[PDB]
């Protein structure tokens, strides 16, 4: 796991500074190591002398140098892939939703974005034997569409204590774009204590369409969104959780591309495009991925969560 920031005091850092760091969001040694010198300067009780000391000491505790692809292929083969509750869909993702990375699921309305997030919020607690993550879930919701009764329906499918599953889902309703980012700083604190295995922001860009209106606020909208997506990438490296954000769509009138622009297209590693099939069937499609080939699968929304096409 990640080393807590308290281990910096044992290396020659004033316990007052650690408190000044922990008031800035940093809670692990990694979070301070990965941080630039610029960020630590922006802290009040920190100067360029301290920041150079903090960065130097923290760098000794976490590897930040070169290795070999062999040593990386080894460490990567032991990465957790959470099942989506669909044999047909996991065969598309070659295992399931991959941890330590940002995954994006966009599509028109009803295409099952929120439904996949509810299934993931349950199956991330199964033992790895059964294809899960053996951890809690963190469901940031910017729409008011978090339904606990949909988590119970999936727990019944996998035979889990519905009362116990709802204890492992830390729910938080974001009301604007500033609050949505504030919830991530509090999120970095919780993941140090417990063991969360899945972070869900649904929808990640819902509140950016309205808080930032026209083109006159376009530049500020993407720069604020870029910091959010960057702060998610930091959580994926600090704790090795799985970040699964959902995205809305927009028509092109010159036939539905996702919003967020190039800021969210480059940041996310895996993009899933969900269409409407027939009846209760849907069609997921590897829109972008570093490793997976471009292909389509057909899942469906059933009364017990996301599952294979029951037909």
């Amino acid at each position: 796991g990640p080393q807590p920031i308290s281990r910096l005091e044992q290396c020659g850092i004033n316990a007052n500074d650690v408190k000044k760091l922990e008031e800035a969001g940093f809670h692990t040694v990694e979070a301070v190591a990965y941080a630039p010198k610029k960020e630590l300067i922006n802290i009040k009780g920190i100067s360029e002398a301290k920041a150079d000391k903090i960065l130097a000491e923290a760098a000794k505790l976490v590897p930040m140098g070169f290795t070999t692809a062999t040593e990386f292929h080894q460490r990567r083969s032991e990465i957790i892939q959470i099942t989506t509750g669909s044999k047909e869909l996991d065969k598309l993702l070659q295992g399931g939703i991959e941890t330590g990375s940002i995954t994006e699921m966009f599509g028109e309305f009803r295409t099952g974005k929120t439904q996949i997030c509810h299934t993931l919020a349950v199956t991330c607690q199964l033992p790895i034997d059964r294809g899960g993550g053996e951890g809690k879930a963190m469901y940031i919701d910017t729409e008011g569409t978090f339904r606990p009764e949909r988590l119970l329906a999936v727990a019944e499918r996998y035979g889990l204590s519905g009362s116990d599953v709802l204890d492992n889902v830390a729910y938080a309703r974001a009301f604007n774009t500033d609050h949505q980012t504030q919830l991530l700083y509090q999120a970095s604190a919780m993941m140090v204590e417990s063991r969360y295995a899945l972070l869900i922001v649904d929808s990640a860009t819902a509140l950016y369409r309205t808080d930032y209106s026209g083109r006159g606020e376009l530049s500020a909208r993407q720069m604020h969104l870029a910091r959010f997506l960057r702060m998610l990438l930091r959580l994926a490296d600090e704790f090795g959780v799985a970040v699964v954000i959902t995205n809305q769509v927009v028509a092109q009138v010159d036939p539905k591309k996702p919003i967020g622009g190039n800021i969210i297209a480059h940041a996310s590693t895996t993009r899933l495009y969900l269409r409407k099939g027939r009846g209760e069937t849907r069609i997921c499609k590897i829109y972008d991925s570093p490793c997976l080939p471009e292909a389509e699968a057909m899942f469906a929304i059933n009364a017990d969560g996301v599952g294979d096409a029951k037909d």
Partner: peptide, 16 residues
């Protein structure tokens, strides 16, 4: 803030 139950650590979901 944090809920008095959200601060609680993970629990392996018992079977049923």
């Amino acid at each position: 803030f944090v809920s008095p139950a959200a601060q609680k650590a993970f629990q392996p979901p018992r079977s049923c």
